[PDB]
Amino acid sequence: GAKQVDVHDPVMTREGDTWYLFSTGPGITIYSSKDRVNWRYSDRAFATEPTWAKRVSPSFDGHLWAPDIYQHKGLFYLYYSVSAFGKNTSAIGVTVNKTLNPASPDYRWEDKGIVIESVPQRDLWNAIAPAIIADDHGQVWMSFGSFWGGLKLFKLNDDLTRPAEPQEWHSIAKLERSVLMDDSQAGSAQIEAPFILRKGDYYYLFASWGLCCRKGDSTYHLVVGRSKQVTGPYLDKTGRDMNQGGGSLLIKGNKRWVGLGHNSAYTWDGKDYLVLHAYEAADNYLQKLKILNLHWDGEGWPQVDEKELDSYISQRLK
Ligand SMILES: [Cl-]
């Protein structure tokens, strides 16, 4: 290729011998790769935009946020966020395809509409940044959230397009906020973008703390907690519940990478990987894809080598 690939809020999956990468961007931006390093543009999920997006977000600009990709019964489920900066006029949608290869006769994204929507003054959460997790009991869950009253988990219905009925919800992580604050304001609870990975006997909840998207002043970083059951509670290394501000440091930025986060995490062929964006100080703070090897310490906690922020170098192909 020649330049690193620029992404925000990345997720990944493999179909056959091809890797696919999904990013925040117009219609959700999709790339493909044979080796996880050299990436070509593949498609955008929506050629224009979801038919319903403007009614949720009247000033919608075409950019969909924070995708999650999930394989289930032979299909590909791509969750995506419609929102507006600074507000909780937001909704998570899902669109489904039979395959990820755009040359395939089976290739077509079909929107299934709104999974969940937040409404100002009704909901103390923000319906963005979905992540899908299955448990040991045949059930599938969505975690999501950003600012307001924090991160939530709810049970999905049988087709994975709406909340199961009757509904079942759980709070999984939170930072301080008084309800006397105006309901329309994001607050000081700088927590977002949950992602859950099952490893050994625990579920691990990753979350982003601090502020993204602000050049030299970004404080964005990753913290983690763990729970025996998918529904919590997620505790940190000191035994503090993430519902009361717990979370142990996984990785933070340095002089070259000022802010990093909004991660995913995967087990591929018996090894584990952390997938994130990081803002490159030497290139106008432009967010680059980073894939790091995910290790586990003697106490059962994830660990990464921050040197891989430099040695993992994606390439954008023609
Ligand atoms: Cl995400």
Gap between the Cα atoms of 280 and 256, Å rounded = 6
Number of domains making up the chain: 1
Distance from residue 144's CA to the centre of ligand 1 (Å) = 8
Which tokens sit at 67?
């995708």
Beta carbons of 289 and 313 less than 8 angstroms apart:
no
Angle at 136 between CA 146 and CA 134, to 5 degrees: 35
Q: Beta strand 169-173 with 63-72: parallel, antiparallel or unpaired?
A: unpaired
Beta carbons of 296 and 302 less than 8 angstroms apart:
yes
Q: Which residue in 17, 106, 165, 192 is the catalytic one?
A: 192
Distance from residue 262's CA to the centre of ligand 1 (Å) = 6
Helix (H), strand (E), coil (C) string for the chain: CCCCCCCCCCEEEEECCEEEEEECEECCEEEEECCCCEEEEEEECCCCCCCCHHHHCCCCCCEEEEEEEEEECCEEEEEEEECCCCCCCEEEEEEEECCCCCCCCCCCCEEEEEEEEECCCCCCCCCCCCEEEECCCCCEEEEECECCCCEEEEEECCCCCCECCCCCEEEEECCCCCCCCCCCCCCCCCEEEEEEEEECCEEEEEEEECCCCCHHHCCCEEEEEEECCCCCCCECCCCCEHHHCCCEEEECCCCCEEEEEEEEEEEECCEEEEEEEEEEHHHCCEEEEEEEECEECCCCCEECCCCHHHHCCCEECC
Distance from residue 19's CA to the centre of ligand 1 (Å) = 18
Q: Which residue in 9, 43, 236, 280 is the catalytic one?
A: 9
- Residue 9 bears catalytic tag: yes
Structural domain span for residue 138: 1-318
Q: In what order do the strands lie in the sheet with 18-23?
A: 11-15, 18-23, 29-33, 38-44, 315-316
- Residue 49 bears catalytic tag: no
Distance from residue 207's CA to the centre of ligand 1 (Å) = 9
CATH number at residue 273: 2.115.10.20
What region, left, alpha or beta, does residue 155 occupy, with left being phi > 0 and alpha being psi -120 to 50 degrees?
A: beta
Distance from residue 79's CA to the centre of ligand 1 (Å) = 10
Distance from residue 130's CA to the centre of ligand 1 (Å) = 6
